From a paper:
For direct comparison with the joint XN structure, we also determined a 2.5 Å room-temperature X-ray structure of hSHMT2 in the internal aldimine state. PLP-bound hSHMT2 forms hexagonal, rod-shaped crystals, space group P6522, with long cell edges (>150 Å) that diffract X-rays to resolutions of 2.3–2.5 Å using synchrotron radiation at cryogenic temperatures. We were unable to obtain neutron diffraction data from the P6522 crystals of hSHMT2 because they diffracted X-rays at a synchrotron only to 2.5 Å. In our room-temperature structure of hSHMT2, the substrate binding pocket is occupied by a chloride anion, Cl−. The affinity of this pocket for anionic ligands is probably dictated by the nearby positively charged arginine residue, Arg358 in TthSHMT or Arg425 in hSHMT2. In hSHMT2, the Schiff base rotates to a much greater extent, with the corresponding dihedral angles in protomers A and B of 67° and 73°. The Schiff base out-of-plane rotation appears to be the attribute of the NSB neutrality as was also observed in the joint XN structure of AAT44. Therefore, the above considerations point to the high probability of NSB atom not being protonated in hSHMT2 either. Protonated N1 was also observed in the joint XN structure of aspartate aminotransferase (AAT), another fold type I PLP-dependent enzyme, where it is similarly H-bonded to a conserved aspartate residue. Because the active sites of TthSHMT and hSHMT2 are conserved we propose that N1 is also protonated in hSHMT2, participating in an H-bond with Asp251 having the N···O distance of 2.9 Å. The H-bond network connecting PLP O3′ to the main chain NH of His380 is identical in hSHMT2, suggesting the same protonation states of O3′, His254, and His380 in the human enzyme as observed in TthSHMT. We believe Glu98 in hSHMT2 is also deprotonated because the electrostatic environment is the same in the substrate binding pocket of the human enzyme.
Serine hydroxymethyltransferase (SHMT), a ubiquitous PLP-dependent enzyme in the aminotransferase superfamily, catalyzes the reversible conversion of L-serine (L-Ser) to glycine (Gly), transferring a one-carbon unit to tetrahydrofolate (THF) to yield 5,10-methylenetetrahydrofolate (5,10-MTHF). As an enzyme in one-carbon metabolism, SHMT is essential to the synthesis of thymine nucleotides, purines, methionine, and other essential biomolecules. SHMT is found as a homodimer in prokaryotes, such as Thermus thermophilus (Tth), and a homotetramer in eukaryotes, such as humans. Like many metabolic enzymes, SHMT is evolutionarily highly conserved, especially in the active site, enabling us to utilize SHMT from Thermus thermophilus (TthSHMT) as a model of the mitochondrial human enzyme.
Residue numbers in the entry:
A (entry chain B), C (entry chain B): 43 to 298, 307 to 504
B (entry chain A), D (entry chain A): 43 to 298, 306 to 504
């Protein structure tokens, strides 16, 4: 044993599973708005010898020695992160050590707030994320609502947009210390200027969680939250198309009276919350951040917006309802209730024909078992060089699946009868098998980033 | 742009940096007890298309669809995790989603305890970890000391061992809800049975943090904490020689009928309470390493780790060095440099300049954290490069030369900053370091190195 | 020394001060809505040998022995408390050990809530009490907002009433565990039925803090909060006209599923929060509770309502504005801004002519230094057998003081110039001295409960 | 109805109950160390028109008006409070508004500490008070253990004294922000200087809860805790012989320039944080009692309290009784009945049936709280009735008879419930108790009694 044997030689069982997942990604239409396909260059840095280095601390302030190369990689990732978003190093710093997006948010809360301090974020069924302080009527679900006190702001159910007026009213009474401007399922742009006004009035910090839109912000195809936010967190996957990791952007310099974010943010990441950094992920992120500075990436992000708009119009022209009427970013929210179907049924039918989407709560749903919506995303297929006409062909495949689900629904009662009818009824299976073959044959023809077999 | 270009072609600046780190790992004597060299097979799974899949939830209970392959990989990693430690699936479950060791411990605290509940762990200067509840006299350092109430237990400075008597005394007064059995700088075995007795008396859960010794436990070369602990956390790197990730083991079944209620709370704390999407590429890399830990090869490796640590301990004693607790029973050695006339901060800097990486360590008794009087040395990393006993005796020879160079510089300098600058400024000293570095690097480059050839 | 010497013989310095305070109470017009004059019978029980008994625990469950007489007194106080409010002993219990009203509320929070649990109460400038969870924008002021998380509900600024709609909206988002229905400066009745609906929807307990109106509730001259509340707290002074102490009423029996308030409420009072009971206060309360069961007390409470209505109409007929337009209880809220004066100036002028009231925040005040209102109360002077015509004569004296303050205001700049002008200007002093003599000569003619000289 | 009717005329049921309690206090031997008999002068101020005045705030800084007389009374009570304990107004301030001793301690915690801050006090079975942070193994009892984090320190069972060594050991690990020096069942003096040394080392505030001994401190018959403590709380009843209320003393001025920041935080915690309107009738009654504590009469009383406690201690030792810590230095005596063959719960019930009120007390070593092995006896109450040494020797004679009656009943009964019923059922036993009660009540009625004549 030398430790230099290949995976295919030493673990055939695992190598086979890697190839099955690689084939599943190539043969299907990936429409989940949070997925993307990472480049081979970043994956090569992710599976590197940088996994073997413990570098607790920060560049120039390490606990162990022998960090001369790791220091340059982390400093390079910091520079490339500031360059990717056109930030002045005198006004902004960045922490590149968060393991993921959720650790990045919890580090910001730990740095700036005492336990049980108050935060406000968009409610989960309204498009927010779990780490924005989600708790039910019975249980504290997210740790952000356990160690801190959260109260959500909601959507205007008539416009499908954030109710900035009700947010301002409740913020005066709740007196939050930090407000989160960021979404996971929201097809419109956030009025960061209005969020800044609410934060300035109640004297709260403005955290921008741009995880879903970070790539579009880097390519300057949508307004940047850095103009108004005190803290900016993001994932490095999603629309940034990198390895799974997290980033924290914080203001530094003079506030009015200097800013005090830097020492607190860094101390919260380490030694408060995390252990040894994952230098292999940090390097893979630095690879992806460099790609985000090229004209290629701006062209890709522009195509993401165009492909999402094309998918929205193609759905409208076939008589589908869209939450908020349309889209201004990378995703679309489809209300299937006017068509007589729900998201739980559509998600299962589309999955059986190699089309991956996720059900989504719509403004008006009182049942979480069968949400009335569906969330569709452009960034993944756009990375396979999909164009507007390609996404209209995707809408054609989706409509076939929806129509099949409508006929299965009229022949079944509850959701369990619906799911089994798709597998048992040999007439529906043959119809699903034919649609799947046309989907997979169409999807396989496009290129795929990364390695060839895994 | 296809995303299929190589790193060397598309990002030469990063490709050069990866190669310099690979050269640094090959040419140096890595003696930090926390490190190991991961196999190429695990690294290939780490940098794969599994990075592209969101699979929030657990096998069979996923938020999104298209997780049929990911469900198999996570279930396979769970099966291999129980096999590697010889656990009965009817009595033990495992969660393979923690991002690292620190998230694994934090997930256990949030699962079992309310905010401000009481925790006891070994004090940090005594050999505990940050995530075991470290506070200073002026500030709460670890988040485990912010969201929860911690009180440390200490070593007996006479013997260098954990004072189990004083632990039982203070646990009766403090009444902790959870006691942590686990260390980062400790050369002896933990009396898990005595820890169990104390936990049973005060009705506390026993958490075993075996991150440093998990590889030795898998090879069954030291007693297993699974015989006494309620919860077992570990890193997947360190002595398990895998990719960086974490694991949580928990009992299930009948407790006394009276059942164990760990499974649902542990899994819920990881997701959706604390973490987001799992890192399936890391999970697969862990599954590869766990398979390797079941082979006879890994048992010979862990046995060699113990032999190499004992040989390094004996060779240090032959040269008039003193060891905390007088020796070692595991993978590391704690050296007390105070009788020799040097400190840990000075020796650490001298050894680093000759490509010998170690870390200074606090000794039982002192309190100066700027100039600790000790040094921590580990065997797992070099043993993975097929070092043997005679090779580690050779390593002590180089260390002995470095300590003597540091002793000469100490008598010519006053402060620590003057000591560090003298190693770079003095031309005679820099020449003695350069020749020692060349002999060290020539010695280290001859041994094999796991992973890829150039990155 | 035997310990049987009188106060006048052993401490002449203290006996003189007791007589000065007794004279000050007889010669002035006491209009503070929270004051009253306790009967001699209750004061005789208050200064009794019951001060000498430690009786930690509850009747039949004491820590020490020799509590046979104290057990009967506490049990008698419990019975008389239930009889004073017409409560079924099978549906209600009472704890008579709280030292005051504020300890009674904190005991309820400690019994029913974990630390940092959420409560809602009427905001302090809107008429609520400090113990209802008051915190400013800079500091947590009340301990109820330190150990627990409070968010206030407010008044509708246009009607001067509680905004029950905004309360229902914010309660759904804040998710409180306990809502407080009770006021310290509010001239209208509380819609306890609507409060019960809001509590039933968000699954919160309804606490009624009837300290100001407890006497009126016992005499059945206003609706009782016991029909809708889960917990009822009150002071024993104020309109109950007893010694200073507190009471906690709690539901017992079957809820739907038995109630679990009794064991938790009692345990919170002792041994959690308080030490040895004050048996001298408990007996003085039992004396006052017996008086509240007589037709005399119902006649007194009816006169309190009539005297407050008479003071309101007399103020209206002289061109004064009243918050919420009038009154339905024992107090009136006077808005002095339409008359060109504030509460800080009126309070000082009235105090100089032996008329005691307190300034009060009005709906619309942005300055707490000079509140625009004044709180006037009927229960104190009604205990001296004041009638409707007597209170109209009180309004005559107040109007003279207000008119004097208006002339001093036009001759001064800030509040400090106003206060000194009343003492320095020998023309204003002579005018204040003449009004004071007419006030004191009028007030001295009425009887006074309690002892004759102290 | 004028409100000027007497209690005997308007409420005969309550007037009869007051007279029965007055007769019970006159005819019994009150030996509960917590009690005293308040003078008539203080009781007259307690039941006065000061009950009618709302004066939220502090002198000069009141919410309402018409407080010119109330301001003088509160300021006079503050002046007399500093005079009674010989304090310099430049170095010490006092707050006279706490409703009782427990609110006084809670106000200090909320003033100086954040929620969940750490507190150390003497454990309840060891002689501490509930408000010092008492928890059980199953529940948080005191609110000081709910809003704050408490860990007890214990007695040395060998000597019955506070283990100052173990306190210093555990305080270094626990790191409390405040340490409480004060007891409810402790017969020896507290080494406040040693407590100060421990607080200085861990940077904690020293709170002296002198509620039981405040009268002895005012008369300067025992060392004063004001020489070492940062904050001093006390009840105004107990040995101060006043009405039931509380006091908070705090240092002011220069700490090391570095000033003391206690005054504004202490006053703010009392109002508006915790309490509402002050009880001015109680404040005036306290002011009367504080004036009495400055006279030579009160010094002779406190000296007689010490002599009477020593005489009761010597008389108990003459009759083969054992005392916790071997004696007493203050106002109370702790008797260990375990060598005598009885327990505290049985003796307490027998003594109560013959008009001798005491309370059972936990002894150092045992854990049965249902049947404690000890008894707490106090001298202040009977000393206020002009008892002398020979009178307390007579009191021990009655106690000795009761303990022997309880011993005979113990050999005829099995359980505690059978023991209690046998004292009422057995005709021979009830007759022996009735004759002992008549001799006790005849002895007690002959002594004077402070307060009013009939209520
Ligand atoms: Cl997402
Ligand atoms: Cl480590
Ligand atoms: Cl009030
Ligand atoms: Cl006591």
């Amino acid at each position: 044993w030398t430790g230099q044997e290949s995976l295919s030689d030493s673990d055939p069982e695992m190598w086979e599973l890697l190839q099955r997942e690689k084939d599943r990604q190539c043969r299907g239409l990936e429409l989940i708005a949070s997925e993307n396909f990472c480049s081979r260059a970043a994956l090569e840095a992710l599976g590197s010898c940088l996994n073997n280095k413990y570098s607790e601390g920060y560049p120039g302030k390490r606990y162990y020695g022998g960090a001369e190369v790791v220091d340059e990689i982390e400093l390079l990732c910091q520079r490339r992160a500031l360059e990717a978003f056109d930030l002045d190093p005198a006004q902004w710093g960045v922490n590149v050590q968060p393991y993921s997006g959720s650790p990045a948010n919890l580090a910001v809360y730990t740095a700036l707030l005492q336990p049980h301090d108050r935060i406000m974020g968009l409610d989960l069924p309204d498009g927010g994320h779990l780490t924005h302080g989600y708790m039910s009527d019975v249980k504290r679900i997210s740790a952000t609502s356990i160690f801190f006190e959260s109260m959500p702001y909601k959507l205007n159910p008539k416009t499908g947009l954030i109710d900035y007026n009700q947010l301002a009213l409740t913020a005066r009474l709740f007196r939050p210390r930090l407000i989160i401007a960021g979404t996971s399922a929201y097809a419109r742009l956030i009025d960061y200027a209005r969020m800044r006004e609410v934060c300035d009035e109640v004297k709260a910090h403005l955290l921008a969680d741009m995880a879903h839109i970070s790539g579009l912000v880097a390519a300057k195809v949508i307004p940047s939250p850095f103009k108004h936010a005190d803290i900016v967190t993001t994932t490095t996957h999603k629309t940034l198309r990198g390895a799974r990791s997290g980033l924290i952007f914080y203001r530094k310099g003079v506030k009015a009276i200097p800013y005090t974010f830097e020492d607190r943010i860094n101390f919260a990441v380490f030694p408060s919350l995390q252990g040894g950094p994952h230098n292999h992920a940090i390097a893979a992120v630095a690879v992806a951040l460099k790609q985000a500075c090229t004209p290629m990436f701006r062209e890709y992000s522009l195509q993401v917006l165009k492909n999402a708009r094309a998918m929205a119009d193609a759905l409208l022209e076939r008589g589908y309802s869209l939450v908020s009427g349309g889209t201004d970013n990378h995703l679309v929210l489809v209300d299937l209730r006017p068509k007589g179907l729900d998201g739980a049924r559509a998600e299962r039918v589309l999955e059986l024909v190699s089309i991956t989407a996720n059900k989504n709560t719509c403004p008006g749903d009182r049942s979480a078992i069968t949400p009335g919506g569906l969330r569709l995303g452009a960034p993944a297929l756009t990375s396979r060089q999909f164009r507007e006409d390609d996404f209209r062909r995707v809408v054609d495949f989706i409509d076939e699946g929806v129509n099949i689900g409508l006929e299965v629904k009229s022949k079944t009662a509850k959701l369990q009868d619906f799911k089994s009818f798709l597998l048992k009824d040999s007439e529906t299976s043959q119809r699903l098998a034919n649609l799947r073959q046309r989907v997979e044959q169409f999807a396989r023809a496009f290129p795929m980033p990364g390695f060839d077999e895994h």
